[PDB]
Amino acid sequence: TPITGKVTAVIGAIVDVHFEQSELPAILNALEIKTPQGKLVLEVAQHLGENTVRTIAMDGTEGLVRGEKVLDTGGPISVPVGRETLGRIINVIGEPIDERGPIKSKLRKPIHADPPSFAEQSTSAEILETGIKVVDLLAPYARGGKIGLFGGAGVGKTVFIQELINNIAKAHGGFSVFTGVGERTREGNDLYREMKETGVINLEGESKVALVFGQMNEPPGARARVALTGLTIAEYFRDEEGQDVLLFIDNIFRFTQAGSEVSALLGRIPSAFGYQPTLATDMGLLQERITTTKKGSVTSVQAVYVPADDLTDPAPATTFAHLDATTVLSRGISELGIYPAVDPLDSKSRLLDAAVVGQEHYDVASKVQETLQTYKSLQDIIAILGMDELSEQDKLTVERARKIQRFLSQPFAVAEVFTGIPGKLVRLKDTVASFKAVLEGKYDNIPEHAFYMVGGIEDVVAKAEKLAA
């Protein structure tokens, strides 16, 4: 004999349900309403008193009537965990959205879980070679670490994640998890068709990745929770399978944004900028679950939208501290045709330290950062008065930054349609050895355009001979 309530109130994604018995459903429980189509899932968010609870709907509330009977599932939204999720595509609510029947997995874990304790923390320092030059040279990513890609509209985030997938995922050993959050349904379809056509997803055999989608056509409920589904699946592999897990989220901002769409309907006094007062804690609860523990390891790449190209917006602002490596994509850089549009100076790693990368690597990285910086400190004068009003020392260091600046641009394999160039992939040792030399002033005679959109050092020589005659 189940636990029934009736809908008292509906505003947008927020549904107030009254419970006739004094046994009220716990906070975070999934409730259900039978619809004409299938099932509408509500999550309990708060107890309002007078035997009513406030809920967030996981789908559009069109058609809901005051009075509607409401079921209590007696548990938080669960998701199929296990290997039977690989190559399948999945709802925020676990349901399989790739038509390919039911995910016949042996278990179903709640999407809400308590992050690992302080005792359960497992700290390392191991470089994840991405093959992308700027990363490996100046801001190297960390295996088991957390990686955020900050960028405004259309600067390069998704294509960057795509190269990260293409480079590291295909041959990784462990299992990946991609979770689309508040982005393009089209991009999902594009990625799905990709993973089939690269053998990472195999319909007629074994697979490497699990797919979870909640995109920008979805109500803010889905967009708020789907990142936890994706996550829960990635936790089972980490914990109950010891697996080194690749988790990919695109985009993590859409989760905070989602939560700021309900906040007021949930009756909260807004904080700075309109955001929910709980912005930092909602982030703590999610982020602090993506982590390398003693049982397993979770390397994750997350795209971070920056609204109105404002890095100081409470959202991306708050995200910075959750990450071991950040790479910031800059419009001003992308508008110069440099790609990845990575900001060599505003991007950061925990691992840019001689203990991890080797003294040489460090020295070279630092001297490169020093060079770029001196150009950047001189921009106001270059722009108004030009190169000819610099001292010759600076004029020399500028001329060299200009070259390194270009030498950091790289053709990506997935960006092959916009560059019209075979996507080069450069090894960390090569990058280190190539930049070291450019610092020593061995290639000053070489015009700038030769360093542009190439691979390692030999490719510049190849382009320099190609251009003279």
Binding site: I269, G274, I384, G386
Partner: protein
């Protein structure tokens, strides 16, 4: 001659300087007219929130 060569390089470098300094004044006039509005709007949101409760 050198001196006249110079006077004609100076009124050229400065001609190009004013033409380029004015390009930055276009960027910073617009960004200002923006940041000025943003300031006023955000103080106004603070005031409206403080005036509900």
């Amino acid at each position: 001659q050198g001196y006249a060569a110079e006077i004609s390089a100076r009124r050229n470098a400065m001609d190009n300087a004013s033409k380029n300094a004015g390009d930055m004044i276009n960027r910073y006039s617009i960004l200002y007219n923006r940041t000025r509005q943003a300031v006023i709007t955000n103080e106004l949101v603070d005031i409206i929130t403080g005036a509900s409760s």
